Ligand binder design. Structure first.
Ligand SMILES: CCCCCCSC[C@H](NC(=O)CC[C@H]([NH3+])C(=O)O)C(=O)NCC(=O)O
Ligand SMILES: N[C@@H](CCC(=O)N[C@@H](CS)C(=O)NCC(=O)O)C(=O)O
Lengths: 234, 223
């Protein structure tokens, strides 16, 4: 059944990405796969058709959510949770080339990158998701719930904004030059937010004017080829 | 600030904080805990924000590494196991196998982003929101139960494989206790606050938690 069929005709090389057209978390992985130069195909599951129920899938991700990545080169190794997939990809790239692209070979920087990465996947993403749920998909309207989560999303961007502003000032103590969260270079730490930054408007957040720094940062990332490519569907 | 050891910034009721205490004492690392009084706003003090930009606990200062600061319980555990392993050559609560590390990371991210937050939201609507709203409560309590189902199904599959090769301890990854299992511990003990009876609703999870709650380092940390 499309899914069962795929699992009977998998490739020996590359990666297969399970995602959704409205899954920022899914595009997050596509972005990273793109940036790292990994060849992949994407399967956009249809939950309404019950594809996530497909036992073959629940084997790839016991959670039955997207994204999930099968690393075909490593004996169809399976990885679920966008953050685990991210750490796996950069680790693999670094060990195959000696170049920590979007990562770092130094433990200290890695822990900072992980700090941000966990913060985005467990503090930014979930809060944005709850704001969308109550403002649009809940069985009834609860304004206090929508405000709670909407405020937290703002609070979180406050944190990022402040970190980007400081990284900026430091460079001044040597105006539109790219500034980043860790090691003054682009990392998965930065990339992990791009996808979500593009949907926060839907809960009333206007990055352009609410968070000057965040805006310039998300704009620098959004102009990246790999980022536009991934976002288009390549 | 010491030149050796670790300073753990937590809060007496933060399960994420004890998650760090547990891993820390389990790996034999020496540490002192600094319980923040959120009433005074010590988590928002500029002194503490320089450590955790998010202004929340847990936060950890690694004195041996020039007072390197780590925030986010997930990032902290990865740092501690990576550090313990680079020092001893023994992947305690971790793994030398990359495929297993990815799996350990999977569960870890799942717990920190799909378990702890949901449990936290159930608590909020059942006890702290400006108004009682059943649907909001049911939403998160159901999701917390859906998650325990995932864990349950995995421990059951793990026990099945064991039996081939019985209250023997089974684990999420590599048939050895890892930070993936310990991550759920602190929270496992509080789901009773939202109506989930682990013993009854999730048998395997129950045994799995007994084993962790019984461990020495765990007890020492849970104080
Ligand atoms: C921006 C839109 C609103 C929020 C949706 C988030 S993307 C799709 C969602 N996936 C996730 O939430 C993944 C979370 C997981 N913690 C990860 O980081 O991989 C899913 O599969 N769906 C859950 C389900 O179908 O039950
Ligand atoms: N870094 C942790 C954060 C855990 C967390 O949010 N802990 C709560 C304690 S229950 C906290 O700091 N609360 C302070 C507040 O809400 O102001 C994680 O996301 O894994």
């Amino acid at each position: 059944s499309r899914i069962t069929k795929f699992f009977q005709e998998q490739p020996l090389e590359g990666y297969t990405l399970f995602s959704h057209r409205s899954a920022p978390n899914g595009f997050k992985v596509a972005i990273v796969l793109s940036e790292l130069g990994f060849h992949y195909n994407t399967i956009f599951l249809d939950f309404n058709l019950g594809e996530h129920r497909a036992p073959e899938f629940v084997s790839v991700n016991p959670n039955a959510r997207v994204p999930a990545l099968i690393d075909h080169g490593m004996d169809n190794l399976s990885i679920w949770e966008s953050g685990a997939i991210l750490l796996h990809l950069v680790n693999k790239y670094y060990k195959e080339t000696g170049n920590p692209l979007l990562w770092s070979d130094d433990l200290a920087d890695q822990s900072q990158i992980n700090a941000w990465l966990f913060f985005q996947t467990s503090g930014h993403a979930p809060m944005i998701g709850q704001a969308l749920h109550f403002r649009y998909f809940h069985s009834q309207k609860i304004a206090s719930a929508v405000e709670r989560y909407t405020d937290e999303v703002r609070r979180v961007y406050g944190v990022v904004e402040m970190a980007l502003a400081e990284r900026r000032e430091a460079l001044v103590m040597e105006f539109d030059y790219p500034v980043w969260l860790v090691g003054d270079k682009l990392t998965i730490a930065d990339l992990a937010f791009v996808p979500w930054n593009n949907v926060v408007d839907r809960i009333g957040i206007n990055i352009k004017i609410e968070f000057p720094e965040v805006y310039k940062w998300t704009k620098h990332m959004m102009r990246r080829p790999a980022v536009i490519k991934a976002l288009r569907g390549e």
